[PDB]
Design a protein around this ligand. Structure first.
Ligand code: HEM
Length: 399
């Protein structure tokens, strides 16, 4: 479905890329997006897919647009009932982020690290003697939701229902509309926020519920909308990213062996994997008519600014599809750039590093299940549909 081409858009800039179903997704999702960086493709193009929108294809422009919040607004960040905070905001933004940093900043992640390891260990040990798993379902999906319950001081018994609600927001089975799933999340959070307003702990919800905004107490509406984002922001991104990384390690024994031999390289490897298997593609909306790098943008045009593409740009990193854990400068915008830079980036890195450290020492040798062709999916958060892995349980190390 190709939306009618707006009069202000010149035909030479038209490239009908579909962010939800790119051509040759079969070759890998990053590769599918990287078509936008072929030499015949301009730095800024218009697609008639998905309502019609601009796409910045190079890291320079992606970074610039994210820095220029006055022209490129977050009021409409998705192509093509959402009310989470502080996503859709462009003074308030700063205070909400400051409050979120209080609950997921480095000192919190540092305190949580060993608990993250103990969770990783328990999951891996549960899988280890089987000699197979679907990594995405059996390790990746249960992990970040459990980390959120730790962060937010919520009981383990609440996981199935909360997981169901967040699953309906991104992959509905039809039982709930997005609005219904969101409201049920709020029905869950509201009593807890109220309770911890009056009797706080040191968990994330307690800290949020007692925050201040513009010199007055954070409202219940503001607090639930922040807690909601802290929950959903760290689920599909981590699930899918872990899956891309493990798929790669399964298919590249030489890279796997490098991390087995030199575990001290795992933090640097994490960063290089974040670049190579970057997965988010958000956008902005034009606040006014604006000429950007020789291209006339119109007030209200949407522009896709794919975080994924900056680090894949050969102008930012040489031989960008190659994975090299020793890169001296790993340039990427995997966690975003500018005023909405991911608040969960420190927690996410710790989850990744802990996962790789524990998997590589317990199950150092694993492969893709023979005959399986790994399928990717594309959209705002690109991903791995399933990741069937196999290993010999006699090569593994028991707890
Ligand atoms: C590999 C994992 C992750 C990736 C790649 C990722 C990526 C991103 C990106 C690109 C943005 C900016 C979106 C934009 O500018 O439009 C963002 C924002 C955000 N992230 Fe993450 N994220 C990850 C993990 C997490 C985790 C674990 C959490 C929570 C614990 C989290 C919470 C948030 C929140 C609350 C925002 C909104 C920030 C704002 O608007 O001020 N993320 N993330």
């Amino acid at each position: 479905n190709l939306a009618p081409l707006p009069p202000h858009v010149p035909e030479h800039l038209v490239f009908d890329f579909d962010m939800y179903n790119p051509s040759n997704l079969s070759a890998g999702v990053q590769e599918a997006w990287a078509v936008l960086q072929e030499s015949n493709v301009p730095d800024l193009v218009w697609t008639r897919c998905n309502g019609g929108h601009w796409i910045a294809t190079r890291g320079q422009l992606i970074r610039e647009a994210y820095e220029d919040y006055r022209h490129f607004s977050s009021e409409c960040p998705f192509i093509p009932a959402y009310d989470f905070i502080p996503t859709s905001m462009d003074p308030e933004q700063r205070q909400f982020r400051a409050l979120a940093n209080q609950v997921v900043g480095m000192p919190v992640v540092d305190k949580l690290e060993n608990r993250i390891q103990e969770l990783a260990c328990s999951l891996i040990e549960s899988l280890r003697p089987q000699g197979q798993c679907n990594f995405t379902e059996d390790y990746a999906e249960p992990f970040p939701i459990r980390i959120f319950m730790l962060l937010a001081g919520l009981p383990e018994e609440d996981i199935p229902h909360l997981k169901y609600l967040t699953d309906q927001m991104t992959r509905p089975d039809g039982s709930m509309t997005f609005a219904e799933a969101k409201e049920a999340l709020y029905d869950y959070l509201i009593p807890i926020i109220e309770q911890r307003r009056q009797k706080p702990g040191t968990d994330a919800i307690s800290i949020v519920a007692n925050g201040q905004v513009n010199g007055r107490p954070i409202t219940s509406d503001e607090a639930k909308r922040m807690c909601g984002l802290l929950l959903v922001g760290g689920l599909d991104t981590v699930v899918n990213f872990l899956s891309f990384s493990m798929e790669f390690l399964a298919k590249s024994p030489e890279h796997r062996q490098e991390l087995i031999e030199r575990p001290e390289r795992i933090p640097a490897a994490c960063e290089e994997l974040l670049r190579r298997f970057s997965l988010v593609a958000d956008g902005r909306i034009l606040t006014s008519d604006y000429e950007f790098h020789g291209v006339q943008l119109k007030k209200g045009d949407q522009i896709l600014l794919p975080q994924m593409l900056s680090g894949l740009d050969e102008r930012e990193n040489a031989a960008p599809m190659h994975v090299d854990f020793s890169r001296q400068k790993v340039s990427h915008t995997t966690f975003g750039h500018g005023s909405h830079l991911c608040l969960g980036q420190h927690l996410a890195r710790r989850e990744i590093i802990v996962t790789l450290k524990e998997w590589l020492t317990r199950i150092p040798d694993f492969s893709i299940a023979p005959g399986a062709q790994i399928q990717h999916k594309s959209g705002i958060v690109s991903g791995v549909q399933a990741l069937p892995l196999v290993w010999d349980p006699a090569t593994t190390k028991a707890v």
